[PDB]
Design a protein around this ligand. Structure first.
Ligand code: HEC
Ligand code: HEM
Ligand code: HEM
Ligand SMILES: [Ca+2]
Ligand SMILES: [Cu+2]
Ligand SMILES: [Fe+3]
Lengths: 145, 445
């Protein structure tokens, strides 16, 4: 029955690819129009994502529960800091933290300093904020990340 | 050897094994930084070491597959490879690419540069010149082996292998699409990671495992190739929609909680398929094959992939549990055992099979090779137990109780020392395998 098993495979696979591509096209639109705010996805937020990327935060941190497991989830850091509805306080809170790293503390995990200017801190602050608003099924469970 | 071009595989394996030794040493270092956080905390920060641990993993596994393809194709296609020159130029591109990556990450060369500096998403941090290199290398590779099958005998092994390999290559192209929208970014990111590891790579694992069992047991084509197509059917049926287990909490629609959670559970089927395939073929077939070691890695592969990918996969795949365990040390435990059983062991099994043939001599260093398996598998599962405990303590302490990340991590220090210790075993294990393969000596009794 080998040529059958082949045909189940070639054919039944093709079936599920289609369903997947259909499903993805739906999901792509759900993301763009409903679950993330396009209007708030400003030039700063892009520049923030880019900064996020080039300094390699993801390889210490996680964002929406994806990344590394070495440092706090930052997908909701702004809520954790009671600062989510205030863009200026967020910027302030982030700059204060990053300026302080590395702690240097013995026995404690260490974050680098990237030599970031204030335009840049703003970019990151705005992006982490914008991330905090992504409608993602009530994850995480609480404020602790 | 039946065909003289099959010796290209030996150069590939050589480099891949070189890179394997860097990969686990990168791991050991990461482990040590966990228990001793101040170490090299300014010259080599964690995220740098990590990129190196993860990329050298992707790169060496691929070189393993490429090597294995250059060994297994001529044998099944009953002809010599279309062009040795392409194979070597391919591998030279790879080595150049992998060098650039090491040197860019370490010294932070050309920070920011669109083409020369590092990018920044998990496993896709390679400067874009390197990503381009990989695609050029992959295409060359795909052309080369494809021509060799076109002009020779086609079999089920060769077909599954070419599909998996072609699918693998083309899905890499998504690594170029980096949308300014985090949710979209995350959605297409899994096209690479998951449709590799649970999609295309699964074909490659099954077709190479087919070819292995074929040669070590002596059961005939029709029994092997039936089971082959069945196994890869169940894989793609469950694997593709099962992508949804990565689509719970990233901003994709709620419906993925159902699709994803259901098709995820079905993913344990192919990994059970392969484990049983391997075990029956053995029981069922000739049992006096001299290559005792390539046998052990082969069963080892299919077994640990089942416990690693299958069970530990299932454990945190249902959104009810995943809500809590997502992005946690539990994740780290699945990933290590899954990667080890499905792909490391599989490359090591095929290395153990082809080394003697390639050197034209008898299966050698069998006791050593096998001791490397127990030491790597031993240490690897112990690591995954220890990170499960740790991830449970974390999940509870931070995700139910709500305690803050850093504080909770002070609670699991003991588990991190235990992982580091278990790491010593894996590294010693991996070096010994390299030794066993690289330096034939008088056999142990
Ligand atoms: C590892 C070498 C790190 C990289 C790269 C980045 N971060 Fe980090 N971060 C790290 C640690 C070990 C900690 C905890 C520090 C402590 O003393 O408790 C942090 C913490 C943060 C925080 C505060 C989060 C919280 O306490 O919940 C923020 C806002 C943060 N980090 C931001 C951040 C950004 C934007 C990064 C890339 C540009 C980044 N971090 C990288 C370790 C590491
Ligand atoms: C030598 C022993 C090893 C040690 C001590 C080790 C340790 C680690 C550490 C500390 C991380 C970072 C996890 C985090 O972000 O918190 C990591 C990541 C990873 N390691 Fe290892 N590692 C080892 C070997 C291996 C092996 C053999 C593999 C499989 C090839 C592997 C695959 C991975 C993968 C895929 C990741 C990324 C994990 C993820 O994001 O889920 N490692 N490793
Ligand atoms: C080849 C086999 C597989 C390998 C190598 C593998 C490896 C991995 C890795 C490395 C991750 C973490 C990715 C990241 O860095 O974000 C992951 C995530 C996951 N895998 Fe697998 N996997 C395999 C198959 C499976 C299977 C069969 C299941 C079964 C259900 C499964 C369930 C999961 C789940 C639920 C997650 C997400 C964990 C979380 O949300 O934190 N995987 N896998
Ligand atoms: Ca991860
Ligand atoms: Cu800006
Ligand atoms: Fe997956």
């Amino acid at each position: 029955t080998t040529s059958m098993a082949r045909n189940i495979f070639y054919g039944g696979s093709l079936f599920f690819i289609l369903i997947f591509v259909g499903l993805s096209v739906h999901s792509h639109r759900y993301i763009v129009t409903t679950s993330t705010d396009a209007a708030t996805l400003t030039a700063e937020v892009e520049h923030g994502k880019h900064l996020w990327e080039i300094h390699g935060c993801v390889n210490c941190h996680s964002i929406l529960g994806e990344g590394a497991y070495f440092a706090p989830e930052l997908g909701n850091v702004m809520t954790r800091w009671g600062v989510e509805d205030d863009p200026d306080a967020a910027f302030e809170a982030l700059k204060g933290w990053m300026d302080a790293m590395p702690t240097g503390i013995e026995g404690r995990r260490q974050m680098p300093n990237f030599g970031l200017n204030d335009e840049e801190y703003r970019a990151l602050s705005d992006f982490l904020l914008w991330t905090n608003t992504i409608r993602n099924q009530d994850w995480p469970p609480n404020d602790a990340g | 050897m039946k065909y003289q071009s099959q010796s290209i595989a030996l150069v590939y394996f050589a480099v891949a094994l070189g890179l394997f030794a860097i990969q686990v040493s990168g791991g050991l270092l990461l482990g040590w930084i966990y228990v001793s956080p101040n170490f090299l905390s300014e010259i080599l920060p964690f995220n740098i070491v990590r990129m190196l641990h993860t990329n050298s993993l992707i790169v060496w596994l691929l070189l393993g597959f490429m090597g294995a393809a250059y060994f297994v194709i001529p044998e099944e296609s009953e002809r010599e490879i279309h062009s040795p020159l392409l194979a070597y130029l391919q591998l030279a591109i790879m080595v150049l690419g992998t060098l650039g990556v090491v040197v860019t990450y370490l010294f932070n060369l050309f920070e920011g540069n669109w083409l020369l500096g590092k990018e920044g998403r998990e496993f896709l941090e390679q400067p874009v010149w390197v990503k381009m290199g990989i695609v050029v290398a992959a295409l060359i590779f795909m052309y080369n082996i494809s021509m060799t099958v076109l002009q020779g005998r086609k079999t089920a092994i060769t077909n599954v292998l070419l599909l998996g390999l072609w699918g693998l290559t083309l899905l890499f192209l998504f690594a170029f699409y980096n949308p300014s929208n985090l949710a979209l970014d995350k959605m297409y990111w899994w096209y690479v990671v998951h449709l590799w590891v649970e999609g295309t790579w699964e074909l490659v694992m099954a077709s190479v495992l087919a070819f292995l069992m074929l040669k070590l047991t002596g059961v005939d084509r029709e029994i092997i190739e039936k089971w082959l197509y069945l196994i890869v059917a169940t894989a793609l049926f469950s694997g593709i929609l099962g992508t949804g287990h990565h689509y719970f909490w990233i901003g994709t629609p709620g419906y993925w909680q159902w699709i994803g959670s259901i098709f995820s559970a079905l993913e344990v089927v192919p990994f059970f398929g392969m484990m049983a395939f391997a075990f029956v073929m053995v029981w069922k077939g000739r049992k006096d094959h001299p290559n005792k070691a390539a046998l052990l890695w082969s069963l080892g592969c299919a077994t640990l992939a089942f416990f690693g990918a299958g069970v530990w996969g299932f454990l945190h795949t249902l959104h009810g549990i995943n809500y809590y365990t997502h992005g946690t040390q539990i994740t780290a435990a699945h990933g290590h055992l899954a990667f080890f059983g499905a792909y490391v062991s599989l490359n090591l099994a095929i290395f153990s099979y082809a080394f003697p043939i390639l050197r034209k001599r008898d299966p050698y260093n069998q006791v050593l090779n096998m001791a490397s398996f127990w030491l790597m598998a031993g240490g690897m599962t112990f690591m995954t137990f220890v990170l499960t405990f740790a991830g449970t303590v974390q999940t509870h302490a931070q995700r139910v109780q709500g305690d803050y990340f850093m504080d909770v991590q002070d609670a699991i220090t003991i588990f991190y020392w235990m992982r580091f210790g278990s790491g010593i075993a894996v590294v010693l294990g991996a070096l010994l395998f390299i030794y066993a393969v690289a330096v034939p000596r008088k056999e142990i009794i």
